[PDB]
Amino acid sequence: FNGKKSLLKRRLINIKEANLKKQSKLILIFICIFTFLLMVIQSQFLMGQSITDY
Amino acid sequence: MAKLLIMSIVSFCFIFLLLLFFRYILKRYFNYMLNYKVWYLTLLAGLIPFIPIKFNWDSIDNICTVIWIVLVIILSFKFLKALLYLKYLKKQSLYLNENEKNKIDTILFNHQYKKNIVIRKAETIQSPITFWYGKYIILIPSSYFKSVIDKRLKYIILHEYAHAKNRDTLHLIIFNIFSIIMSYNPLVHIVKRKIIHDNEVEADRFVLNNINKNEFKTYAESIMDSVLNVPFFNKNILSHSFNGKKSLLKRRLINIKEANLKKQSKLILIFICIFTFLLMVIQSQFLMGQSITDY
Amino acid sequence: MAKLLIMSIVSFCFIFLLLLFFRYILKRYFNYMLNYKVWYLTLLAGLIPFIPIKFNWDSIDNICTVIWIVLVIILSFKFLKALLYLKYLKKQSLYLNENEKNKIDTILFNHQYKKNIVIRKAETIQSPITFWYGKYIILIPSSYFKSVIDKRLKYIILHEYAHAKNRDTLHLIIFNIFSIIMSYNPLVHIVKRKIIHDNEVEADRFVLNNINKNEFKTYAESIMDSVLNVPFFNKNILSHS
Ligand SMILES: CCCCCCCCC/C=C\CCCCC(=O)O[C@@H](COC(=O)CCCCCC/C=C/CCCCCCCCC)COP(=O)(O)OC[C@H](O)CO
Numbered sequence: 017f018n019g020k021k022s023l024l025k026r027r028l029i030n031i032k033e034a035n036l037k038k039q040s041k042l043i044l045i046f047i048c049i050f051t052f053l054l055m056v057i058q059s060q061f062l063m064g065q066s067i068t069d070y
Numbered sequence: 071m072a073k074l075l076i077m078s079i080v081s082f083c084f085i086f087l088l089l090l091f092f093r094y095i096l097k098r099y100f101n102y103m104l105n106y107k108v109w110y111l112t113l114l115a116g117l118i119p120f121i122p123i124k125f126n127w128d129s130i131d132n133i134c135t136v137i138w139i140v141l142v143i144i145l146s147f148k149f150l151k152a153l154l155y156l157k158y159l160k161k162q163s164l165y166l167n168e169n170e171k172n173k174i175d176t177i178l179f180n181h182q183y184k185k186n187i188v189i190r191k192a193e194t195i196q197s198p199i200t201f202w203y204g205k206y207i208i209l210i211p212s213s214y215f216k217s218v219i220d221k222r223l224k225y226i227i228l229h230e231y232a233h234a235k236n237r238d239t240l241h242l243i244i245f246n247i248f249s250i251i252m253s254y255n256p257l258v259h260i261v262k263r264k265i266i267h268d269n270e271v272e273a274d275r276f277v278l279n280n281i282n283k284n285e286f287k288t289y290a291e292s293i294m295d296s297v298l299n300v301p302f303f304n305k306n307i308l309s310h311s312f313n314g315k316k317s318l319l320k321r322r323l324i325n326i327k328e329a330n331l332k333k334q335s336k337l338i339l340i341f342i343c344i345f346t347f348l349l350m351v352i353q354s355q356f357l358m359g360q361s362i363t364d365y
Numbered sequence: 366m367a368k369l370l371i372m373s374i375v376s377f378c379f380i381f382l383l384l385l386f387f388r389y390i391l392k393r394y395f396n397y398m399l400n401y402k403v404w405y406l407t408l409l410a411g412l413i414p415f416i417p418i419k420f421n422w423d424s425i426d427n428i429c430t431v432i433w434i435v436l437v438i439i440l441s442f443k444f445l446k447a448l449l450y451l452k453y454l455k456k457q458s459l460y461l462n463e464n465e466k467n468k469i470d471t472i473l474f475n476h477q478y479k480k481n482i483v484i485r486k487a488e489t490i491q492s493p494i495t496f497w498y499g500k501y502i503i504l505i506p507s508s509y510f511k512s513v514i515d516k517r518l519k520y521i522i523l524h525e526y527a528h529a530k531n532r533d534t535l536h537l538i539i540f541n542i543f544s545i546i547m548s549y550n551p552l553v554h555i556v557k558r559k560i561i562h563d564n565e566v567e568a569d570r571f572v573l574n575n576i577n578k579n580e581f582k583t584y585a586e587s588i589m590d591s592v593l594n595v596p597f598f599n600k601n602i603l604s605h606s
Pocket residue numbers: 083087093094256257260263264
């Protein structure tokens with residue numbers, strides 16, 4: 017009956033399902049290492065600067 | 071020259087989208103919390119283009135040159151305003167009576183936590199709040215202990231601890247300042263806000279993990295009352311408050327509490343509309359046109 | 366033709382900002398509300414320089430055309446799906462019994478309010494909703510009437526009645542259509558939120574005015590419970606929950 021979804025409402029929703037999960041770092045790591053490599057790629061791909069201006 | 075900025079904006083948005091991308095599934099299908107610390111990487115990556123790796127139309131840059139500077143200056147103010155408040159706030163506190171301490175300890179000894187953070191009382195602000203400085207300060211009004219049989223102490227106290235544990239109040243400050251210099255890309259503000267929601271969710275988990283289920287129900291009910299009693303605040307961006315945040319629901323509650331019984335004399339609308347209209351007429355007097363007219 | 370795009374956007378934003386100043390100040394300092402109807406005039410203004418009445422670029426122009434076309438098509442699709450959702454709800458509704466009618470009568474007895482709008486019930490949804498069609502339909506859960514002591518009925522009825530009185534639902538319908546077509550100026554979409562925000566506030570003012578001071582807190586408590594104990598849905602985003 018609330019006008020629209022917001023924070024108080026979201027919190028109450030989560031209160032209904034116990035988060036009985038072992039949220040192992042395994043997953044975050046997989047993403048984090050992937051992510052980092054992509055920034056590496058971004059670098060080879062593109063850089064520039066004004067230091068060139070002889 | 072500002073071509074660099076454009077490059078910067080693009081890089082930022084790239085990583086930004088990447089994180090947002092993953093999140094959906096991780097919660098939607100697996101109910102995982104994403105450990106928010108990952109977000110610092112967006113900033114880093116976004117700024118890589120500034121490194122001199124080495125391995126007319128530009129009038130606009132003559133201008134963008136100072137847009138940067140001005141924004142920083144304004145933000146310097148914004149930031150400091152809050153910081154100064156914190157100066158003020160901190161110095162007004164006091165330590166506590168043993169009996170309260172005994173109660174407090176009874177609640178929390180179970181954790182036997184790393185007590186290198188601090189508990190103190192207040193004679194000022196209505197709701198308990200927290201911020202960092204270098205000490206991890208938890209501050210709560212005296213009315214709550216004088217009301218020794220309030221019971222809700224059981225839950226309120228723990229909540230604050232939960233913010234203390236991940237050092238939310240530390241990161242927040244740093245993050246803010248750093249972002250201020252890179253004032254150029256509004257997406258960073260999305261992030262500035264977004265991060266908050268996660269912190270609060272985690273805090274709720276934290277609490278539930280320390281109580282019964284019968285109690286869960288009770289707790290949830292107590293939160294609602296904790297929202298009810300007062301107007302909210304935005305006093306310290308460099309802090310976390312208790313009443314959740316600026317919102318529609320809250321605004322409506324505030325108004326219903328206040329008297330609201332009067333008509334404004336009709337002219338106000340009669341004229342505001344006339345006014346608006348004449349001006350658009352004027353706008354038109356000079357401005358109109360479309361390509362079909364171009365024989 | 367880029368020029369026309371630009372003009373339309375600019376014109377709209379000009380007035381838009383003007384209006385915002387007024388509302389803020391007027392409420393902030395003198396405690397008054399403005400009747401939201403004025404907002405239609407922003408759409409109008411935005412389309413004046415637009416009509417062909419005077420009283421490199423090639424690429425830019427070509428693409429702009431294409432985007433306009435697609436935006437309208439997809440928003441319409443979204444809108445239409447919702448529209449039949451509404452059809453569904455109507456089909457499934459039913460009238461109430463005599464005593465239930467008698468309860469309504471009591472609540473509205475001294476109100477003697479216009480009866481050219483309709484009150485009906487269904488088991489389909491956990492909380493009441495309303496919509497327009499042309500008949501002003503108020504729908505409540507069929508599970509509520511039997512509760513001899515809910516003391517919700519009183520408040521729920523006035524709340525909705527009040528919404529019905531101002532024909533707010535109609536305005537949203539048409540209003541949305543115009544933004545469906547003029548899909549590109551983000552400001553045009555944004556104003557929708559403002560309309561809703563106030564529409565509900567105003568409704569509350571109405572209700573409070575019809576109840577005892579001693580129960581003001583009662584009303585408020587129910588408002589909270591109405592949220593606390595329920596899941597959220599927005600299938601009909603064109604309607605009020
Ligand atoms: C600049 C704005 C300033 C105003 C802010 C002031 C207001 C401050 C706002 C702060 C509070 C947040 C309120 C929440 C509102 C909201 O809808 O924003 C949500 C993001 O939605 C988007 O994906 C869209 C968000 C982006 C907004 C624009 C909409 C368009 C999106 C399409 C972009 C995708 C295309 C990619 C290419 C981008 C390159 C340009 C919030 O994220 P989350 O809660 O994690 O949801 C998870 C979701 O289930 C997971 O699905």
